[PDB]
Curated annotation (Swiss-Prot), chain A:
The modification N6-acetyllysine is found at K82, K140. The chain holds residues 95 to 1717 of 3142 of the full protein. The gene is HTT. It comes from Homo sapiens (Human). The N-terminal Gln-rich and Pro-rich domain has great conformational flexibility and is likely to exist in a fluctuating equilibrium of alpha-helical, random coil, and extended conformations. It is linked to Huntington disease: A neurodegenerative disorder characterized by involuntary movements (chorea), general motor impairment, psychiatric disorders and dementia. Onset of the disease occurs usually in the third or fourth decade of life. Onset and clinical course depend on the degree of poly-Gln repeat expansion, longer expansions resulting in earlier onset and more severe clinical manifestations. Neuropathology of Huntington disease displays a distinctive pattern with loss of neurons, especially in the caudate and putamen. This is Huntingtin. Interacts with PFN1. Interacts through its N-terminus with PRPF40A. Interacts with PQBP1. Interacts with SETD2. Interacts with SH3GLB1. Interacts with SYVN. Interacts with TPR; the interaction is inhibited by forms of Huntingtin with expanded polyglutamine stretch. Interacts with ZDHHC13 (via ANK repeats). Interacts with ZDHHC17 (via ANK repeats). Interacts with F8A1/F8A2/F8A3. Found in a complex with F8A1/F8A2/F8A3, HTT and RAB5A; mediates the recruitment of HTT by RAB5A. HEAT repeats lie at residues 110-147, 152-189, 430-467, 530-568.
Length: 1144, 150
C-alpha cells in the first residue's frame, strides 16, 4: 500500500480549504483529528512519501492564517510534549517559529509557560538533526515570545544549554551557543542579561593554568562570537578586560581545533568592539591602571610605557607567521594555511584602532646577535603576498588597505611629520611608497578568490589618499579597478562598484587638471584622462547590462550614490574644480496628498539639478538603442530607485525631456510602449519596477495641468493616463482570478497578450502556498502585488467622481479577493477612492559670503455605500493581526470616516471596536507589546477626533500612564502629544481647565528637543488670543530651562536639537528676557567633568544658544553694566582649571 | 643592448602592472640596436603576446603598436610580415582611447617610410587615407577644443 498511502494524505487537504465554512461547531472537530495525521505521512520512511506529503501540510496553514489561527496552534503544541520520533518532532518545529509572530499578545502569556518544559527536553536530545532546527527557532520564538517572561523563567533556561556545551559533536556545539545569545536580545532587560553570561563562562576558565577538558574550551569561545556584536547593571569595563587576556593564552594552547577557535573571536572584537573595552587598549598605560615558537622578551599586557595593542601585534606574529631572525616565510607544514589565514585578518583590524603597532620591533629585548645577524620589524607580514593559495595573498591584500586608511585618520593627513617621530624611536624604514605597489599587484592576481579580497582593500584606502599628500599614488588605484570590470566571477564585479560608489568624483576631477605626466602615464598617451565619463558610461551603466540578477541590482544603488558626486564641467554655480570641493564641506560644517507628487514652489539647488539630468540621459539610451534582452530589463530597475531617493516632483527640471515644454512629464512615453508589448511583462522581477516608475512621471504634471478625465486638462497627457488606468485594472483582474481559483472595463479574456500574463502569476503562487516562509521581502507575487496597488492609488487623485462613477462597481469587487494576501496596501487602495468619491558663486560666496548673511538676517527678525461589505472586513483584521505595518494603515482609514461624516454605524449595536483600543494601552506601559513605536503616533489621532461627536477628560488620563509608568520618551511619550496639542491648542469654561493640565506635563519633559517643537505652538496662540496671557507664560519657562542649561540636563546633542531652541528665544516674550540677571548665571558656568564627549558636547551648546539672545534681544550697553556688579572673574575656565577636569 | 634582450622575454613568455611597462622600455633602446641579428629577436616576442594576452588591455595596447611596427621596417616588409603588421594598424584607429589613437599613427610612418612596400598592402594605404579626411573637418574651425598632440 505504498502507492495507496500517497493518495490518502492529499485528499484530506483539499476538502478543508474548499469547505468555505469556518468557526463552526461542526468545523472545529474535524481539524483537530486529521492534523496530527499529516505528520505520520512524513514519519513513514520513504522519500516518495516523505517529500510528497510534507509540502501538502503547508497548503493548510497559509490558507488558514487569517481564519483559524487559535485552532491551528493548539494541536501543534501537543506534539512537542508527546516528544515523538526524531523525524516526526523535527518538521513540526519549522512550523512553530514562523507562527510565533502571528499570535496575539492577549493569548501569548499562556503560550510562554508551557514551552519551557518542552524546550528543555529537545535540548537534552542527542540526535544531531533535532538539535539543528532549534538553532533556527530559538532565534525566532524567543524574539516574539521574549518580552513576556520574568527574571525567574529565563534563568532556568540558560543553565541547560551550557550543559549542552559539554558534548563532543561539532553539530551540537554550535546550536547551544546561538541559543544563549538570542534570548538576551529579547529577555526582559537586554543590557542586564549581557553581564550575566560573562560571569558564568570565565569560571569555566578561572585561572588558565589548569586542565580544562579541551572540548569544553571550545564551548566558551563560540558563545562569545555571537554576543560581542550585541555589546555595542551593565557589562562592566573590568568585566570585558578579563575576556581579552583569556584568548592570548589560547592562541598558544596547541590543537588545530582550539587554535582556530580563539582566532575567529579576535577578528570580530576589533571590528565591532565594545566601547568600554576599546579605550583601555588604545590608552598608553592601559591594563596597568586596571590592576591598580616565541623566544624573546615580548613584554606582556600588564607593562606600562606601551599600549596593549602595541603588545598584541608582537605576540600573534612570532608564534604563527614570523620567525624572529630574518625575513623568511614560515612553512605550511608547521602551521596550517587555514590557521595562517585568520592571523592576517587580526593584525589588520587593530591598525584601524591603534596604528603605532605595525611600526614596532618584533622583540622588545633583542634576540641573540651571535646567532642572527640582523633583527627585523613587523614588515615581514607584508611578504605574504607571494605565499601560495588565496586568502593569504588576499589577506595580505587587505592588510595594506587598513594600514593606509588609519595613518591618514590618525595624524590628520600629515604623513610628513608623523613618520619622523617613529623612525628615531623604532628604526624601521617603511614608507607608504613601498606598500601601494604591493597593493597594485594583488589586483592583477590570477585566481578569482584572490581578486575579491584585494578590492575590499580599496574601499578603505582610496578615500583617504586622494585627499592627502600622496594623491599621486591615490589616483592610480582608481585607474586599475576599471580594468577589473570584465572578470567572470560574480563576486569580483560587485565589490568593484562599491569602491566606485564611495568615490567622490568632484574631488577626483580636481587632480586631473594638475596632472601632466599622469595623463601620459605608461606608453605616453596624448589626450585627457577622462575618469568620470569612463567610470559612468563604461562601468556603472554598463554593469546594468549584466546577465546575473545579483549584478544588476547592486549597480542601481550606486547611481543613488553617484549623483550628488559628479562635477560636470562649467555649471552656473561651481565653476572650477577648486570651488567644487568647497561646497560639499560647508553644508556639513556651517549651518494629505499621496506620496508621489508635490504642490510647493519647491526650492531646489540649481547645480544639483544638473547632475541628475545627465544620469537620466545615458540611462534612457541603453533602453531604446539597446539590442539585448538584458539591457532593457535591468535598466527599468535603475530608474525605480532614483525616483524613491530623488523624486520626480521635487527634481522635475532634471527629469524633464520634452513634454509639456515649459511641472514635467519626463520620459514616460517610452515606458508605456515597453508594457504594451507582449514580451516585457512576462517576468515579475522587473515588471513590478516599471509600474512604480510610470506613476511618478504622470504625477509631476499635477502642479501644472489640472485646471474623458476632466481634471487632467492637457490632451497630450490623457493617452498616458488612459493607458495605465487601463493597464492597472487588468492586473488587479489577473490577481483576482489567481488568489481565487476561477478559470480565465478591465477584462483579459479576449486579449491573447494578457493570457500570457495569467501563466506567470500562477507559477509564483504555487510556490508560496506550498512553501511556508512568512518573512520574505522578495516574493515576486507578494512583491508584485505590492507594486500594482500602490500605483492604482496615485492615479485616482487625478481622477474625479465622473470618471470613477462607472468603476466604483469594478474596483471594489477585486479587493475583496485581494484583501487576504496583502491587506497593508489594499486599504491604501481603499483610502484614496473615498477621497475622490467625495471630491477630495566663486569660493568667497560659498565658504563665507553666502553663509555669513543667513546669520545676520535672522537676527533683525529676532528684534521682532458599496464600502459596507468591504469596511466591515477590515475591522476583524485589526483585532487578530500582529504585524504593526498593518495596524498603522487601519487607524488612518477611520480618521477619514469621521471627518467625512459617515455616521457611527460601523458598530451598529455595540461598541466592539472602541473597546479594543483601550486594552492596547495596557500592553505598552508594562511593555508587553512588540512594535508600539510605529503605532503610538497614530493611535492618538483616532481618539481625539471622535470626541467632537471617549471624551477629552478621558483622553488625557491615558497619556499620563505611558510617561511616568512605561518606556522612554522619544518613542512613546513625545509622539503621544503631537496629536493632542495640535488638536487642542490650535483648534467655554470646560475648555479653560484642560489647557492648564497639558502645560504642566511638558515641564517634566523640557529636556528633549522634540518637546521643544510642541511648545513653539503654544506661544503663538497667546499672542493672538490674549496678550495679557502671553507674557505670564513666557516667564514660567524662563527660570526652568536656564537652571537646566547650567547643569546640562537639556538634550541638545543633535543639530536637529540646536535648531529648535533658537526659534524659541525669538518667540519668547522679551519682557521675560529683559533682566540680564538670569541669562548670565546660566551662561558663565563650568560643567561637572569634561572628560567625556557626552558631557563636553552639552556644555558648549548652552553657550551658543543663550548668546543668540545677548546679540539681538539686548544690545552692548546693557550687558556690561551688569558684570561690574556680578563678580564674574575671567579665571572661570582657565588653563589651570581646564586641565584638572579632563583628567577628573 | 645584448643583455637586455634576454631579460624582457622571460617576463613576457608577471603581474598586469609589470606587463605594460616592459614593452615600453624595449622601444626606446631601439635606437641602439646595431645588428640584423638584434632586430629579428624583437619581432618574435611581441606577436606571441597578442594571441595570449587579452585584446582589451588598452594601456598595453598603445605601447606595442609602436613596438611591432618599427621591427618590420628594418626587417623586410614581406608577404609573411605584411599580413600580421597591416591588420593591427586598422583596429586600433577604431579604438575609443584617444592616447591609443596616437601611438598607432607613428607605426604607419615607418612602414610608409623607406621600404618599397608590397603592391597589395599599399592598397591598404586607402585604409589610412580615409581616417585623415574625417578628423580635419572637425578640427578645422576649432583646434582649442579637441586636442594638441593628437
Amino acid at each position: 500500500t505504498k502507492k495507496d498511502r500517497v493518495n490518502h494524505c492529499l485528499t484530506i487537504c483539499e476538502n478543508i480549504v474548499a469547505q468555505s465554512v469556518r468557526n463552526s461547531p461542526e468545523f472545529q472537530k474535524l481539524l483537530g483529528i486529521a492534523m496530527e495525521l499529516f505528520l505520520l505521512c512524513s514519519d513513514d520512511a520513504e522519500s516518495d512519501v516523505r517529500m510528497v506529503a510534507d509540502e501538502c501540510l503547508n497548503k493548510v496553514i497559509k490558507a488558514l492564517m487569517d481564519s483559524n489561527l487559535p485552532r491551528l496552534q493548539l494541536e501543534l503544541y501537543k506534539e512537542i510534549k508527546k516528544n515523538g520520533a526524531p523525524r516526526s518532532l523535527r518538521a513540526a518545529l519549522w512550523r512553530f517559529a514562523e507562527l510565533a509572530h502571528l499570535v496575539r499578545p492577549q493569548k501569548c502569556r499562556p503560550y510562554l509557560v508551557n514551552l519551557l518544559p518542552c524546550l528543555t527536553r529537545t535540548s537534552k536530545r542527542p540526535e544531531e538533526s533535532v538539535q539543528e532546527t532549534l538553532a533556527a527557532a530559538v532565534p525566532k520564538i524567543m524574539a516574539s515570545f521574549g518580552n513576556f517572561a520574568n527574571d525567574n523563567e529565563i534563568k532556568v533556561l540558560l543553565k541547560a544549554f551550557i550543559a549542552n556545551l559539554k558534548s563532543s559533536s561539532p553539530t551540537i556545539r554550535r546550536t547551544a551557543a546561538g541559543s544563549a545569545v538570542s534570548i538576551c536580545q529579547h529577555s526582559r532587560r537586554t543590557q542586564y542579561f549581557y553581564s550575566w553570561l560573562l560571569n558564568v563562562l570565565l569560571g569555566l576558565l578561572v585561572p588558565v593554568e589548569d586542565e580544562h577538558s579541551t572540548l569544553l574550551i571550545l564551548g566558551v569561545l563560540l558563545t562569545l562570537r555571537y554576543l560581542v556584536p550585541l555589546l555595542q547593571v551593565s557589562p562592566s569595563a573590568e568585566q570585558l578586560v578579563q575576556v581579552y587576556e583569556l584568548t592570548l593564552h589560547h592562541t598558544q594552547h596547541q590543537d588545530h581545533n582550539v587554535v582556530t577557535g580563539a582566532l575567529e573571536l579576535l577578528q570580530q572584537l576589533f571590528r565591532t568592539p565594545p566601547p568600554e573595552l576599546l579605550q583601555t587598549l588604545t590608552a598608553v598605560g592601559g591594563i596597568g591602571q586596571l590592576t591598580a615558537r616565541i623566544k624573546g622578551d615580548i613584554g606582556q599586557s600588564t607593562d606600562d610605557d606601551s599600549a596593549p595593542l602595541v603588545h598584541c601585534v608582537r605576540l600573534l606574529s612570532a608564534s604563527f607567521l614570523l620567525t624572529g631572525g630574518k625575513n623568511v616565510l614560515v612553512p605550511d607544514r608547521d602551521v596550517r594555511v587555514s590557521v595562517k589565514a585568520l592571523a592576517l585578518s587580526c593584525v589588520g583590524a587593530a591598525v584601524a584602532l591603534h596604528p603605532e603597532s605595525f611600526f614596532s620591533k618584533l622583540y622588545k629585548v633583542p634576540l641573540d646577535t651571535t646567532e642572527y645577524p640582523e633583527e627585523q620589524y613587523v614588515s615581514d607580514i607584508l611578504n605574504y603576498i607571494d605565499h601560495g593559495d588565496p586568502q593569504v595573498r588576499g589577506a595580505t591584500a587587505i592588510l595594506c588597505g587598513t594600514l593606509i586608511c588609519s595613518i591618514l585618520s590618525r595624524s590628520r593627513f600629515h604623513v610628513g611629520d608623523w613618520m619622523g617621530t617613529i623612525r628615531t624611536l623604532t628604526g624601521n624604514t617603511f614608507s607608504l611608497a613601498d606598500c601601494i605597489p604591493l597593493l597594485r599587484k594583488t589586483l592583477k592576481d590570477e585566481s578569482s578568490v584572490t581578486c575579491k579580497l584585494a578590492c575590499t582593500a580599496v574601499r578603505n584606502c582610496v578615500m583617504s589618499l586622494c585627499s592627502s599628500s600622496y594623491s599621486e599614488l591615490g589616483l592610480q588605484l582608481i585607474i586599475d579597478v576599471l580594468t577589473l570590470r570584465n572578470s567572470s566571477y560574480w563576486l569580483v564585479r560587485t565589490e568593484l562598484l562599491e569602491t566606485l560608489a564611495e568615490i567622490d568624483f568632484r574631488l577626483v576631477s580636481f587632480l586631473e587638471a594638475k596632472a601632466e605626466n599622469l595623463h601620459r602615464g605608461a606608453h605616453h598617451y596624448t589626450g585627457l584622462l577622462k575618469l568620470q565619463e569612463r567610470v559612468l558610461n563604461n562601468v556603472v551603466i554598463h554593469l546594468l547590462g549584466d546577465e546575473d540578477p545579483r549584478v544588476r541590482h547592486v549597480a542601481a544603488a550606486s547611481l543613488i550614490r553617484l549623483v550628488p558626486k559628479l562635477f560636470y564641467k562649467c555649471d552656473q554655480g561651481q565653476a572650477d574644480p577648486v570651488v567644487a570641493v568647497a561646497r560639499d564641506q560647508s553644508s556639513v560644517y556651517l549651518k494629505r496628498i499621496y506620496r508621489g507628487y508635490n504642490l510647493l514652489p519647491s526650492i531646489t539647488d540649481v547645480t544639483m539639478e544638473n547632475n541628475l539630468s545627465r544620469v537620466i540621459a545615458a540611462v534612457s539610451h541603453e533602453l531604446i538603442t539597446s539590442t539585448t534582452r538584458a539591457l532593457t530589463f535591468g535598466c527599468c530597475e535603475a530608474l525605480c530607485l532614483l525616483s524613491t531617493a530623488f523624486p520626480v516632483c521635487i527634481w522635475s527640471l532634471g527629469w524633464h525631456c520634452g513634454v509639456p515644454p515649459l511641472c514635467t512629464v519626463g520620459m514616460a512615453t517610452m515606458i508605456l510602449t515597453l508594457l504594451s508589448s507582449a514580451w516585457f511583462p512576462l517576468d515579475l522581477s522587473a515588471h513590478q519596477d516599471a509600474l512604480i516608475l510610470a506613476g511618478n512621471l504622470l504625477a509631476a504634471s499635477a502642479p501644472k495641468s489640472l485646471r474623458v478625465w476632466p481634471a487632467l486638462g492637457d490632451r497630450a497627457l490623457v493617452p498616458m493616463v488612459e493607458q495605465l488606468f487601463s493597464h492597472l485594472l487588468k492586473v488587479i483582474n489577473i490577481c483576482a482570478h489567481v488568489l481565487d481559483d476561477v478559470a480565465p472595463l478591465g477584462s483579459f479574456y479576449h486579449l491573447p497578450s494578457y493570457l500570457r500574463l495569467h501563466d506567470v502569476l500562477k507559477a509564483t503562487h504555487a510556490n508560496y502556498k506550498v512553501t511556508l516562509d512568512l518573512q520574505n521581502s522578495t516574493e515576486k507575487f507578494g512583491g508584485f502585488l505590492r507594486s500594482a496597488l500602490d500605483v492604482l492609488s496615485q492615479i485616482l487623485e487625478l481622477a474625479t467622481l465622473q470618471d470613477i462613477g462607472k468603476c466604483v462597481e469594478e474596483i471594489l469587487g477585486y479587493l475583496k479577493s485581494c484583501f487576504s494576501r496583502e491587506p497593508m496596501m489594499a486599504t491604501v487602495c481603499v483610502q484614496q477612492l473615498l477621497k475622490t468619491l467625495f471630491g477630495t558663486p566663486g569660493l568667497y560666496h560659498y565658504c563665507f559670503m553666502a553663509p555669513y548673511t543667513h546669520f545676520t538676517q535672522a537676527l533683525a527678525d529676532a528684534s521682532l455605500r458599496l464600502f459596507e461589505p468591504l469596511v466591515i472586513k477590515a475591522l476583524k483584521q485589526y483585532t487578530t493581526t500582529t504585524c504593526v505595518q498593518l495596524q498603522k494603515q487601519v487607524l488612518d482609514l477611520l480618521a477619514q470616516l469621521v471627518q467625512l461624516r459617515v455616521n457611527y454605524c460601523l458598530l451598529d449595536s455595540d461598541q466592539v471596536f472602541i473597546g479594543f483600543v483601550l486594552k492596547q494601552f495596557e500592553y505598552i506601559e508594562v511593555g508587553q507589546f512588540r512594535e508600539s513605536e510605529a503605532i503610538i503616533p497614530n493611535i492618538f489621532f483616532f481618539l481625539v477626533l471622535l470626541s467632537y461627536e471617549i471624551g477629552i477628560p478621558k483622553i488625557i488620563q491615558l497619556c499620563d500612564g505611558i510617561m511616568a509608568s512605561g518606556r522612554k520618551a522619544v518613542t512613546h511619550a513625545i509622539p503621544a502629544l503631537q496629536p493632542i496639542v495640535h488638536d487642542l491648542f490650535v483648534l467655554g469654561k470646560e475648555l479653560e481647565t484642560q489647557k492648564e493640565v497639558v502645560v504642566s506635563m511638558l515641564l517634566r519633559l523640557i529636556q528633549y528637543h522634540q518637546v521643544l517643537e510642541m511648545f513653539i505652538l503654544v506661544l503663538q496662540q497667546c499672542h493672538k488670543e490674549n496678550e495679557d496671557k502671553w507674557k505670564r507664560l513666557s516667564r514660567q519657562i524662563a527660570d526652568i530651562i536656564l537652571p537646566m542649561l547650567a547643569k546640562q540636563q537639556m538634550h541638545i546633542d543633535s543639530h536637529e536639537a540646536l535648531g529648535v531652541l533658537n526659534t524659541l528665544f525669538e518667540i519668547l516674550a522679551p519682557s521675560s528676557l529683559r533682566p540680564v540677571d538670569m541669562l548670565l548665571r546660566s551662561m558663565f558656568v563650568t560643567p561637572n567633568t569634561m572628560a567625556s564627549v557626552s558631557t563636553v558636547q552639552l556644555w558648549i551648546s548652552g553657550i551658543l544658544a543663550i548668546l543668540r539672545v545677548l546679540i539681538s534681544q539686548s544690545t552692548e550697553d546693557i550687558v556690561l553694566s551688569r558684570i561690574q556688579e556680578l563678580s564674574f572673574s575671567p579665571y572661570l575656565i582657565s588653563c589651570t582649571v581646564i586641565n584638572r577636569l579632563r583628567d577628573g | 643592448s645584448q643583455f637586455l634582450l634576454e631579460l624582457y622575454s622571460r617576463w613576457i613568455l608577471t603581474p598586469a602592472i609589470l606587463i605594460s611597462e616592459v614593452v615600453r622600455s624595449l622601444l626606446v633602446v631601439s635606437d641602439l640596436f646595431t645588428e640584423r641579428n638584434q632586430f629579428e629577436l624583437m619581432y618574435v616576442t611581441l606577436t606571441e603576446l597578442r594571441r595570449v594576452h587579452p585584446s582589451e588591455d588598452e594601456i598595453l595596447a598603445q605601447y606595442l603598436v609602436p613596438a611591432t611596427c618599427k621591427a618590420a621596417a628594418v626587417l623586410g616588409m614581406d608577404k609573411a610580415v605584411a599580413e600580421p603588421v597591416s591588420r593591427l594598424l586598422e583596429s586600433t584607429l577604431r579604438s575609443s582611447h584617444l592616447p591609443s589613437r596616437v601611438g598607432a599613427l607613428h607605426g604607419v610612418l615607418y612602414v610608409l617610410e623607406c621600404d618599397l612596400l608590397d603592391d597589395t598592402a599599399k592598397q591598404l594605404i586607402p585604409v589610412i587615407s580615409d581616417y585623415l579626411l574625417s578628423n580635419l573637418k572637425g578640427i578645422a574651425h576649432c583646434v582649442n577644443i579637441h586636442s594638441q598632440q593628437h
